[PDB]
Amino acid sequence: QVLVLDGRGHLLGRLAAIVAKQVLLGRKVVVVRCEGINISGNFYRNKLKYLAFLRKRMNTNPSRGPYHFRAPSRIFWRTVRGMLPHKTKRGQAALDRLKVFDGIPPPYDKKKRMVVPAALKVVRLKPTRKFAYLGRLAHEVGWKYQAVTATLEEKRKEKAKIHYRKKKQLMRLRKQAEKNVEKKISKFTDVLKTHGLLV
Amino acid sequence: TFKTVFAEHISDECKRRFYKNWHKSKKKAFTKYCKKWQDDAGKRQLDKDFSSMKKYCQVIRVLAHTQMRLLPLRQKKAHLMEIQVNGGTVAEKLDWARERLEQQVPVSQVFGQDEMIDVIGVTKGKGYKGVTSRWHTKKLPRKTHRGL
Amino acid sequence: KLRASITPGTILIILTGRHRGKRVVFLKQLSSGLLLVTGPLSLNRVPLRRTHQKFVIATSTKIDISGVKIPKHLTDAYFKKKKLRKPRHQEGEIFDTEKEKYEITEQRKVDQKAVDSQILPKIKAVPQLQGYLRSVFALTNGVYPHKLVF
Amino acid sequence: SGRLWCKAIFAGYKRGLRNQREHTALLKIEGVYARDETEFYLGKRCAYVYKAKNNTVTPGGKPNKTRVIWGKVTRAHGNSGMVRAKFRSNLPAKAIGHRIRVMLYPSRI
Amino acid sequence: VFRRFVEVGRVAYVSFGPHAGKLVAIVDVIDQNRALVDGPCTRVRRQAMPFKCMQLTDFILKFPHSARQKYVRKAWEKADINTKWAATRWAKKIEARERKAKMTDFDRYKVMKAKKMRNRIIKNEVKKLQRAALLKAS
RNA sequence: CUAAGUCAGAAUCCCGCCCAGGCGGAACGAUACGGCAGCGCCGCGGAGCCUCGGUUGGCCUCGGAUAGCCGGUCCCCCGCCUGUCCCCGCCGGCGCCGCGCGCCGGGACCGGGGUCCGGUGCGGAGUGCCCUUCGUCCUGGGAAACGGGGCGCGGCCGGAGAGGCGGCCGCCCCCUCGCCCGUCACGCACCGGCCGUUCGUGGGGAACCUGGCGCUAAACCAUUCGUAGACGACCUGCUU
RNA sequence: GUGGCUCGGGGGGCCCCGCGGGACCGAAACCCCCCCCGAGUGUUACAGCCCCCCCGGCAGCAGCACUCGCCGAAUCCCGG
């Protein structure tokens, strides 16, 4: 259908190198919560490796200089553009399938979001190596919405818990409903675990 | 911008603003909007608008236009401006604006004396000027066989 | 030739006919190397019918068979479209709306009814089976025709 | 009834790095994600279905807008489970990410 | 915190390689990664195989330091690993994925109807359990 | 003073104020008879070009990895609508209530953090996953009779981050069939063995044809001003 | 096995009568128990853990579907 990748605990490059292939293959990928995307290495080191990109602009022009997009949505969407062709016409008709957001907008709020274990930090980084949150790195170099997004996330995480509190309470009823009507689903549940289900 | 609410009576000074020809046009502006404050049904819709603005809107501003039937200009076109309100909780901030609506606001209620205020406005205009009058760069010597 | 997994009285999935995916009951191979196929009328509305070896998926679900009688007659120009196609008299005047007809038989009718007489009781022996033949095969999300075994 | 054809994704041509040999495609069948489970699909007639402007006849029915370019699946590719395919008329390079049906019916079971 | 150790006499489960699906007993440790193991009753040979390939299991045998197969078999079958393993909740999960992968097509149809009826039953009996739960909340 | 962790720190560096406002979104105002009309909203037809993809769905906890999950809790305080409902409390119509209150407080609270133990954990409360089942017709069993359907009505929500809608309810009409097993009967369902939309399609755009509810202009030029000006642009004035 | 030690676990005073003539028939420890159980030390050191080596003497399954480590095909062919 439409992937909705959760970008909390992922590494920048290894996640982009996976989305870049999917987009060129035609699937519409949408990423959320990029502001939690980790990176390898120090933090003082990577801030130097971004304040080494703000310099690379022939300053008083935007023509003879590049664009230093700062919001973490654009930082990741830029480091994907590197991994695709974009001078072609399948390059620009692919890049506009990937859609990158900060936090979680309401359309993708009520959607199950799939992690990508190939790039996950707890898998691809040793337990002792250090790492740098994209949020603090981006908020340091001029992002102006470290707080506005943060309060909104507090609003959502509670509004999700209300749903889950409801979701847990239901499954107890279905779990209990089996014990009530076990006397007359006997010959079905038998054939389900003959075939390997429910064991 | 979240929502906008306009007063029931709009001074015909202000209606001048949204137009480009007061001699040509039939001046039908906001006429269909003066009704929502006239019948009951709109009030039930309108008061909902203000209540929503209480719960959601963080910073509230008010659209205040100037007098022109007093200034000795050639102008009859009022200037509309957003003015922010800085104060307590949003609900009382809104209940303040819904109260001040449609009324006059003197200068004293806004400022004081011996305060510091900041003057913002479009500079004068001297037109297409060379580089010596623009950036105050040095003039070359007198003997240059081209523009000096 | 026949593949190693097709035996008389096995269930198939037909893949390229008018009905693209019914289950059927295979009887035997003709002299002309095409499977004799019948998913009996009262379960699929499929009559005695030839089908090719290659176009048919074999399934691991068989029923014992002893109604293999009634040798073949099948051919074409027998149900061939003789309303639109060339053969109506092998002639080339204006047709294709002038005379509409498809040949329809009586011997096939008794032939079909005299075959499932031996078959249908054997089908009913396994419970829920006639339900399985009525429904039609169709892939779905999470169905990988390389990973599921028939 | 649902689809009787497996899904697949056209993914390019067989290309060295610059000499793009434009007569042998590279499918990626949805689901097969490693070689040695690709011995089931190879040899089955595939198809590329697309619409157009002018009508064309349809075997078995009335003319419609649909046109198809038939093909076949020849041999395995790489290790991730892609399969080369030899189309009767080389694919138009417009569909570089779009659908390519892999029918089932040339069968080996 | 850790509650399953690797020591002389453990019984590990092989997951990757030619010997997947068979339990194996750990005899001796040679280095970080390889471990000299053996299965007498699981038809496995005495050979090293890397620690990456084993999933640990709760059970423990008794070995001195390292022994022949004559004395690994005895302590293996005096504790009935071949049956204790089959009684665990773990094994029943492996045989569940090993039946689901055996489903013949007509069989799968049986489940389609069976799982169809079994879900209507719960759907109604939840609603009757849904009404009372709200009713007793008031 | 460093390996893990933590502090002070500067004309630097980053942001703020300040200057422009993206093939970037916003909110609101008005919407062309003084017509032989052009029109916007709800109902429903019939053609005539086109642009393309697709070919069940998955409506959501947070979060860790040298740990997590699910449950019942008599135990414990509370973030709770001044922490909500009954009530001793002053007075009236003080056993009862608030035409006023304050819940000091006993007690009632669906919840959640906490306690405690009881279960799983190469995770079955499993994305190795879950939900929906796509040939037509008698009767005769099983769950069912708190079931279904009608772009139904009236209210509640609930939603603003790119709610742009989804859900809950009260009432209206008729059915007892819709699901699982049976028996019986079927238009030989046309291809005779054989190809391309089986569906999300009431998809998007545009031009001509069917009612009711209802709408009646703004921009630019010509003119004027000089708060602007090389010509454009800009700031302004013109039947009360 | 024994040896000195350290750590936890089983509990250990008691009946009977329809609040009474007196104590939750409850473990309660400021603590006590063993010839009790499960582990870390050093110890001589058995064959109720073994391992290796040396005398004499058993058919065992063949380069193994017990998938521990070779090279091959007048010692080589069959089926798809």
Swiss-Prot record, chain B:
Question: At what sequence positions does the UniProt record place the cross-link Glycyl lysine isopeptide (Lys-Gly) (interchain with G-Cter in SUMO2)?
Answer: K124, K126
Record PTM Tele-methylhistidine, positions in chain: H145
Q: Which residues are modified to N6-acetyllysine?
A: K36
Entry comment on modification after translation: Constitutively monomethylated at His-145 by METTL18. Methylation at His-145 regulates translation elongation by slowing ribosome traversal on tyrosine codons: slower elongation provides enough time for proper folding of synthesized proteins and prevents cellular aggregation of tyrosine-rich proteins. It is not required for incorporation of RPL3 into ribosomes.
- Report the subcellular localization: Nucleus, Nucleolus; Cytoplasm
Q: Which family does it belong to?
A: Belongs to the universal ribosomal protein uL3 family.
Subunit and partners? Component of the large ribosomal subunit. Interacts with DHX33.
Sum up the protein's function in the record's words: Component of the large ribosomal subunit. The ribosome is a large ribonucleoprotein complex responsible for the synthesis of proteins in the cell.
What is the official name of this protein in its record?
Large ribosomal subunit protein uL3
The protein's organism comes out as: Oryctolagus cuniculus (Rabbit)
UniProtKB/Swiss-Prot annotation, chain C:
Classify the main location.
Answer: cytoplasm
Q: Which GO terms describe its molecular function?
A: RNA binding; structural constituent of ribosome
> Which Gene Ontology cellular component terms are annotated?
cytosolic large ribosomal subunit; rough endoplasmic reticulum
Kindly state a single biological-process term from the GO annotations of this entry: ribosomal large subunit assembly
| Compartments (UniProt record) | Cytoplasm, Cytosol; Cytoplasm; Rough endoplasmic reticulum
Leader sequence segment: none
Question: Which top-rank group of organisms is this from?
Answer: Eukaryota
Q: N6-acetyllysine-modified residues are where? A: K101
- Give the keywords, sorted: Acetylation, Cytoplasm, Endoplasmic reticulum, Isopeptide bond, Phosphoprotein, Ribonucleoprotein, Ribosomal protein, Ubl conjugation
Residues modified to N6-succinyllysine: K69
Q: Which family does it belong to?
A: Belongs to the eukaryotic ribosomal protein eL6 family.
According to the record's subunit comment, the protein's assembly and interactions are: Component of the large ribosomal subunit. May bind IPO9 with low affinity.
| Free-text function comment from the UniProt entry | Component of the large ribosomal subunit. The ribosome is a large ribonucleoprotein complex responsible for the synthesis of proteins in the cell.
Q: What is this protein called?
A: Large ribosomal subunit protein eL6
In its UniProt entry, the species of origin is given as Oryctolagus cuniculus
The gene that this protein is the product of is RPL6
Summarize which stretch of the complete protein this chain spans: 142 to 291 of 291
From Swiss-Prot, chain D:
At what positions is N6-acetyllysine found? Answer: K7, K62
A GO biological process of this protein is: translation
Identify the InterPro entries for this entry.
Ribosomal_eL33, Ribosomal_eL33_CS, Ribosomal_eL33_sf, Transl_B-barrel_sf
Its keywords, alphabetically, are: Acetylation, Cytoplasm, Ribonucleoprotein, Ribosomal protein, RNA-binding, tRNA-binding
Principal place of residence: cytoplasm
Gene3D superfamilies in the cross-refs = translation elongation factor selb, chain A, domain 4
Do you know which PROSITE patterns this protein is assigned to?
RIBOSOMAL_L35AE (PS01105)
| CC terms in the record's Gene Ontology section | cytosolic large ribosomal subunit; synapse
Q: Name one Pfam family in it.
A: Ribosomal_L35Ae
Please name the GO terms that the record assigns under molecular function.
Answer: structural constituent of ribosome; tRNA binding
The N6-succinyllysine modification is found at K62
Location of the protein in the cell = Cytoplasm
Sequence similarity = Belongs to the eukaryotic ribosomal protein eL33 family.
Q: Which PANTHER family match?
A: 60S RIBOSOMAL PROTEIN L35A
Question: What task does this protein carry out?
Answer: Component of the large ribosomal subunit. The ribosome is a large ribonucleoprotein complex responsible for the synthesis of proteins in the cell. Required for the proliferation and viability of hematopoietic cells.
Assembly description: Component of the large ribosomal subunit.
- Protein name per the record: Large ribosomal subunit protein eL33
Swiss-Prot record, chain E:
Task: Please identify the protein, giving its name as recorded.
Answer: Large ribosomal subunit protein eL14
Q: Which UniProt keywords apply?
A: Acetylation, Cytoplasm, Isopeptide bond, Phosphoprotein, Repeat, Ribonucleoprotein, Ribosomal protein, Ubl conjugation
Is-annotated flag, keyword Transferase? no
Biological process annotations from GO: ribosomal large subunit biogenesis; translation
Location comes to:
Cytoplasm
Kindly state the subunit structure of this protein.
Component of the large ribosomal subunit.
GO MF terms listed in the record are: RNA binding; structural constituent of ribosome
Region of the whole protein represented? 2 to 139 of 218
Principal subcellular localisation of the protein:
cytoplasm
Positions of post-translational Phosphoserine modification: S138
